[PDB]
Design a protein around this ligand. Structure first.
Ligand code: HEM
Ligand code: HEM
Ligand SMILES: N/C(=N/c1cccc(CO[C@@H]2CCNC2)c1)c1cccs1
Ligand SMILES: N/C(=N/c1cccc(CO[C@@H]2CCNC2)c1)c1cccs1
Ligand SMILES: C[C@H](O)[C@H](O)[C@H]1CNc2nc(N)[nH]c(=O)c2N1
Ligand SMILES: C[C@H](O)[C@H](O)[C@H]1CNc2nc(N)[nH]c(=O)c2N1
Ligand SMILES: [Cl-]
Ligand SMILES: [Cl-]
Lengths: 361, 361
């Protein structure tokens, strides 16, 4: 067990210190770690290792198109938290600093790691900011992707107003406790963007909106054998995530038919390509709405260009590039991006972010 | 060598006869084949085996979304040809019968197979009907994908008029001959569709058009160890092939900027999603134009629905399904199809159609 930890530690420190220009400080740091592992059963990252490890992990995320700015990640070290009030305020602070009045800072807050595979902090939220979902005999409300977590929260004394956009509470469980606590979100901390169209005034009749900052809070950060199961991170949205998936998928908000209505086209014939046309106008609306409000967002064409630069930067730096083609291509006009026309190695490189099992369900 | 042939033969005949309800006739047919191989070094398919083998090959084509109608394939047995006039007239006939006045019949014409890996007939065309491409100091004309074949044809005494839509000649080489012959296509045999838009009259200013029937003529059909290197096949187009790739790719006709102009939108900002909007209108134009002229075509939504039925038909029949996710998803709105949201096994099953090296280049 402390063998696999030692092995990953050797690989990580060598690479991390190499990139940081600290290649000479390796042996003595690896020395201390080997002792610390022998005596304690684990080791503790320096602030520098942790910060860079979180950046390397983003860089190795095969499914991420926004990796160009991996080195500008804002890393918050909250390994000091011991109380649920401390966790809550850390999460509250993350939302505030990442939002930054709309000029979103890509940020990660890092909580204490697993000890013996035992979690210190266990976050139930998929994202820190997400809408509830309800299904009750034919009546479908909100975000269906949140149906299971919502039912779980309502098992704990929470109650949603049952709008299509109920903000889910923060819900996490501390080590020792049998149940998670939940805290309602302060509305003043959550930026939302109402969806309007630049040309079509009737688009507002849909009363669509989305939240400003996507903060993934259910993935495990792995850095040199250390498992930070609780390390919520954020960037800004690519418009397609909202307009082509969240609001378009039949198993999500399923709004394409209503979009077709308000833009004045029939939704009767496949050969009219009404879904395609609705997707374009909806995605135009999303980008326009975020930019009009001053909330950071990127379109899929610009993002692909940035990713091309990331590919170029990688080869120039002598690093192997890895990627998941199936996730890197945007869900609209993917053949209009260079991504579609080349292949990527889907090998896993650590440090990285990983899926982990949900405590609920 | 006759070991691998015998092995593939055993696997094929057993499966083919099983599907045909002729499972009892297997041993005696396998008997004759084993003798025929021993004495001759190869074996000859019955008409029934060949017809069904060609259908099974289509069914096993992982990259094909149109596989629902695999069993309705029109198979033409031209293993009898010996002369280049016979080949030419066979190819001429294929075009005519497949076109069928616009009501396209999915058809394959099968020529004599390789003997000792030696080709009887060697087709140079990618498709029987395709446009030439020219590149001469900054001057780019026609289809760039045809640049190498065009130069090759012009090395043989052919000369194109250098329009953007020069019909390439049929070009193939007979066994024994050192050079291929080429035959100009009779215009009366080639249906073309001028591209118009249902709502936007200015779209005709682009003077776009495409050919009616895509007839792939450079792939090898493999059936039970027998290599039919020359077996051109056709179906009808999925609109996206023309509107989202052939006319949209920068390395093809690259028409999106001009489409944006004629539909009256700016092509200046990525966030306007002008490429996405142009793709939709161009693809609407393509579908409308084919249907208006009475030439068979399918949109990507309908095609995906048909493919879903193919998936259902396959499981119901107890057959494993194989597919290439990266090719099955349409290049526009793929997330609007069920294909995007499931995975496919990309295993190779024979019989099948395979790539083979180009004689030119
Ligand atoms: C800066 C702006 C960013 C943009 C525009 C961006 C874009 C994207 C997009 C569009 C996806 C696909 C998500 C989906 O389809 O559900 C993605 C996946 C991902 N991104 Fe990023 N990203 C950004 C920043 C970050 C940051 C800061 C991290 C973490 C340090 C990160 C790590 C990931 C990971 C781990 C995934 C895959 C999640 C999964 O497998 O489900 N990205 N990114
Ligand atoms: C009936 C109408 C048909 C439709 C709508 C259809 C649709 C498609 C499409 C859209 C592709 C992708 C082509 C590309 O992206 O370049 C494809 C690939 C393919 N189709 Fe079909 N197809 C049809 C009939 C057939 C037939 C009759 C055959 C042969 C018996 C066939 C075998 C294949 C093969 C082998 C490929 C892959 C070619 C490659 O790997 O480059 N299909 N099909
Ligand atoms: N733009 C983003 N979009 C996403 C990035 C990663 C994941 C997700 C949502 O998670 C997937 C949705 C369904 N399965 C996992 C969204 C980011 C969130 C945090 C940093 S970038
Ligand atoms: N619809 C079609 N489209 C295609 C199907 C298969 C292949 C192609 C074109 O070949 C690819 C284009 C570039 N590489 C190979 C087009 C068909 C042609 C013949 C039967 S169906
Ligand atoms: C690299 C990638 O495999 C390549 O660009 C593929 C992607 N999927 C495709 N799918 C289809 N139908 N046709 C294509 O030409 C391609 N190109
Ligand atoms: C089956 C397939 O892998 C799945 O639907 C994937 C495809 N590519 C994707 N790409 C992104 N960015 N996001 C997704 O949710 C998916 N879904
Ligand atoms: Cl999201
Ligand atoms: Cl084509």
């Amino acid at each position: 067990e402390k063998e696999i930890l030692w092995n990953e530690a050797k690989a990580f420190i060598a690479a991390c210190y190499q990139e940081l220009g600290k290649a000479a400080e390796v042996k003595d740091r690896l020395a201390d770690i080997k002792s610390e592992i022998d005596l304690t059963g684990s080791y503790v990252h320096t602030k520098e290792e942790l910060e860079h490890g979180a950046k390397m992990a983003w860089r190795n995320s095969n499914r991420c198109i926004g990796r160009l700015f991996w080195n500008s990640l804002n890393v918050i070290d909250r390994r000091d938290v011991r109380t649920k009030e401390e966790v809550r305020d850390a999460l509250f602070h993350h939302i505030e600093t990442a939002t930054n009045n709309g000029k979103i800072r890509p940020t990660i807050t890092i909580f204490p790691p697993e000890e013996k595979g035992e979690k210190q902090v266990e976050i139930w939220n998929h994202q820190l900011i997400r809408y509830a979902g309800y299904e009750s005999d034919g009546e479908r409300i909100g975000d269906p992707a949140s149906c299971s977590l919502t039912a779980a929260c309502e098992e704990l004394g929470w109650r949603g107003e049952r709008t299509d956009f109920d903000l889910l509470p923060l819900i996490f469980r501390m080590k020792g406790d049998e149940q998670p606590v939940w805290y309602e979100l302060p509305r003043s901390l959550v930026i939302e963007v109402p969806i309007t169209h630049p040309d079509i005034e009737a688009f507002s009749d849909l009363e669509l909106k989305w939240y400003g900052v996507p903060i993934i809070s259910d993935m495990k950060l792995e850095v040199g054998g250390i498992h930070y199961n609780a390390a919520p991170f954020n960037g800004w949205y690519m418009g397609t995530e909202i307009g082509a998936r969240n609001l378009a998928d039949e198993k999500r908000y399923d709004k394409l038919k209503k979009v077709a209505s308000v833009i004045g086209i029939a939704a009767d014939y496949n050969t009219d390509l009404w879904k395609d046309q609705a997707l374009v106008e909806l995605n135009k609306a999303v980008l326009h709405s975020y930019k009009k409000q001053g909330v950071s967002i990127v379109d899929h064409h610009t993002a692909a260009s940035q990713f091309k630069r990331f590919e170029e930067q990688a080869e120039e730096a002598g690093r192997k590039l890895t990627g998941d083609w199936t996730w890197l291509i945007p869900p609209i006009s993917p053949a209009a991006t260079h991504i579609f026309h080349r292949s990527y190695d889907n090998s896993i490189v650590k440090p990285n972010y990983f899926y982990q099992d949900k405590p609920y369900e």
